Amino acid sequence: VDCGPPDDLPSGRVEYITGPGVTTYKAVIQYSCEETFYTMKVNDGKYVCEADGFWTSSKGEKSLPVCEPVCGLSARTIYGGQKAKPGDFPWQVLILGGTTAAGALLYDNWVLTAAHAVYEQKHDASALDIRMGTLKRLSPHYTQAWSEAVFIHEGYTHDAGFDNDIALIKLNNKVVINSNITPICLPRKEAESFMRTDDIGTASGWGLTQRGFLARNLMYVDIPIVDHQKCTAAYEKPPYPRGSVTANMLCAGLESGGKDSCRGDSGGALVFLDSETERWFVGGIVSWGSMNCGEAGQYGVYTKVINYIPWIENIISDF
Numbered sequence: 212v213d214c215g216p217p218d219d220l221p222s223g224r225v226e227y228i229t230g231p232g233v234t235t236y237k238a239v240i241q242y243s244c245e246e247t248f249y250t251m252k253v254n255d256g257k258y259v260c261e262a263d264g265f266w267t268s269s270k271g272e273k274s275l276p277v278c279e280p281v282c283g284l285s286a287r288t289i290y291g292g293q294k295a296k297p298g299d300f301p302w303q304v305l306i307l308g309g310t311t312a313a314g315a316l317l318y319d320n321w322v323l324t325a326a327h328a329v330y331e332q333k334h335d336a337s338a339l340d341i342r343m344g345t346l347k348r349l350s351p352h353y354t355q356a357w358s359e360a361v362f363i364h365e366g367y368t369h370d371a372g373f374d375n376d377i378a379l380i381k382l383n384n385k386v387v388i389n390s391n392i393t394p395i396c397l398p399r400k401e402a403e404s405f406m407r408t409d410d411i412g413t414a415s416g417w418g419l420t421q422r423g424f425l426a427r428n429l430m431y432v433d434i435p436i437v438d439h440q441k442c443t444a445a446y447e448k449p450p451y452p453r454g455s456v457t458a459n460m461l462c463a464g465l466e467s468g469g470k471d472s473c474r475g476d477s478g479g480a481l482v483f484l485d486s487e488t489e490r491w492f493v494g495g496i497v498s499w500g501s502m503n504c505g506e507a508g509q510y511g512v513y514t515k516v517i518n519y520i521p522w523i524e525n526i527i528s529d530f
């Protein structure tokens with residue numbers, strides 16, 4: 212009974228415990244991740260060669276563990292905002308091609324964004340130019356990524372309302388997770404308790420500022436979640452379609468108006484602090500709002516990410 216050479220672990224390594232190359236029955240190997248920016252999932256990495264001839268873990272698993280990136284780290288821990296510092300938003304992704312937009316890194320090979328930001332480039336099969344690790348929209352120094360595949364929500368209808376304004380981009384290569392590039396966490400199920408009316412989220416982006424031009428450097432604002440009736444009402448008026456605010460949206464902004472996301476922030480993550488895990492998570496995706504950014508009483512409208520966890524998980528788990 213010889214189990215053979217073990218499979219390599221992405222974002223991790225394998226090591227022979229019993230001896231270099233010892234792949235015989237009861238041989239022991241050890242998988243490991245880079246534990247600073249990755250954490251091993253599934254098992255402890257200890258695999259023993261079994262009589263059936265397959266490397267097998269302390270739990271009986273015959274397949275590899277997973278090195279999953281740490282998420283939601285921030286150095287803290289757009290209209291009316293202030294300039295982000297390096298590592299404030301390590302998940303921030305710039306998406307260039309057709310117009311300026313943004314996304315948020317998930318894991319080391321996915322970008323969460325708004326469908327409206329990528330629908331047109333998707334449907335004429337032009338790969339997305341995805342950039343990260345950079346505070347400056349126009350800097351020539353950045354981490355390059357390219358879309359391998361773009362998933363637009365099957366219930367999103369382009370230019371016909373913003374319900375289901377969510378998309379996932381699979382990168383053709385993993386990005387290196389470090390202090391400047393770190394994904395955002397997905398909300399845990401109870402994360403709603405951090406996304407109540409008057410809880411504070413953070414929007415970041417290079418979009419229009421109060422001066423009415425795109426920003427050169429990444430900007431951010433802290434904004435409160437707005438009561439959903441109040442948001443629904445603010446958009447029940449021409450020129451907006453009937454029922455523009457749905458239960459798949461959360462609103463955030465000021466009755467006064469001087470804090471908002473704008474054109475060019477599309478697809479950015481509206482993040483919130485899980486004060487118990489002490490990690491940032493994505494509560495919203497920058498989706499739509501009034502054509503006058505930062506207008507009084509016209510709140511930013513964000514795709515409500517917690518409603519899309521099955522969809523997100525379905526896509527990431529299957530591709």
Ligand SMILES: CCc1ccc(NC(=O)Cn2c(N)nc3ccccc32)nc1
Nearest residue numbers: 450451472473474477498499500501502
């Ligand atoms: C059907 C009527 C109608 C007309 C114009 C608009 N305007 C916007 O949605 C502005 N806006 C964009 N384009 N990205 C944003 C990102 C964040 C906030 C606002 C944003 N909405 C509805």
